[PDB]
Amino acid sequence: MELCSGKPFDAFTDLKNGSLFAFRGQYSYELDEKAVRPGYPKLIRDVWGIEGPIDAAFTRINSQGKTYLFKGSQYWRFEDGVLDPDYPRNISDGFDGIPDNVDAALALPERVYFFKGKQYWEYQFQPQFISRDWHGVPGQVDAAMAGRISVFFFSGDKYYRVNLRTRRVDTVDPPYPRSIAQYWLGCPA
Numbered sequence: 001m002e003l004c005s006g007k008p009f010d011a012f013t014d015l016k017n018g019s020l021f022a023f024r025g026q027y028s029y030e031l032d033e034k035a036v037r038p039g040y041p042k043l044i045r046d047v048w049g050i051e052g053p054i055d056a057a058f059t060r061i062n063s064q065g066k067t068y069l070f071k072g073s074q075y076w077r078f079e080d081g082v083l084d085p086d087y088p089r090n091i092s093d094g095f096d097g098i099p100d101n102v103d104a105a106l107a108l109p110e111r112v113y114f115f116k117g118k119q120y121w122e123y124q125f126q127p128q129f130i131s132r133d134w135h136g137v138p139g140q141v142d143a144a145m146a147g148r149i150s151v152f153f154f155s156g157d158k159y160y161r162v163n164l165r166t167r168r169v170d171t172v173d174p175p176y177p178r179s180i181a182q183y184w185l186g187c188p189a
């Protein structure tokens, strides 16, 4: 399936050195201005060595910049695009109190947020309600990604941008939620 199909996404890694990966079904999409063929559909099995679909992803913004991919009760940890030793692991082994089958995740430089249903968990290296703490985000999300000053929440074929300081949905034209394909990916539409 092509990047600009208009279909919902499953997961996004966090922005690292200006690039990230998008996941949908069995496919991995590399989004980087410096890439020769940005957004070519590659198999997750080829790039990451695991079967899609994946539930959630995040990337730490420390020196090592490890990427974490979640599916079911399992997670995989990558550095330099290679699976670390002793992965995959049960989520319970690395992430005390975080549930299985998460909807989304994002990392901030150090906290990770995990999203599932109407709730989210904070993990540092009880659940709270998404809507109470992420003002204007209506509840359940499919995917999430953190940048520098904003996080992005993906719901179906649309998304929200949330300011990290205010934890509020930004006021843009046309307003959030809006098309991922048209306004986030810059897809010809």
Ligand SMILES: [Ca+2]
Pocket: 009, 010, 011, 054, 055, 056, 102, 103, 104, 141, 142, 143
């Ligand atoms: Ca997901």
Ligand SMILES: [Cl-]
Pocket: 010, 011, 012, 013, 055, 056, 057, 058, 103, 104, 105, 106, 142, 143, 144, 145
């Ligand atoms: Cl995600």
Ligand code: NA
Pocket: 011, 012, 013, 014, 056, 057, 058, 104, 105, 106, 143, 144, 145, 146
């Ligand atoms: Na993510």
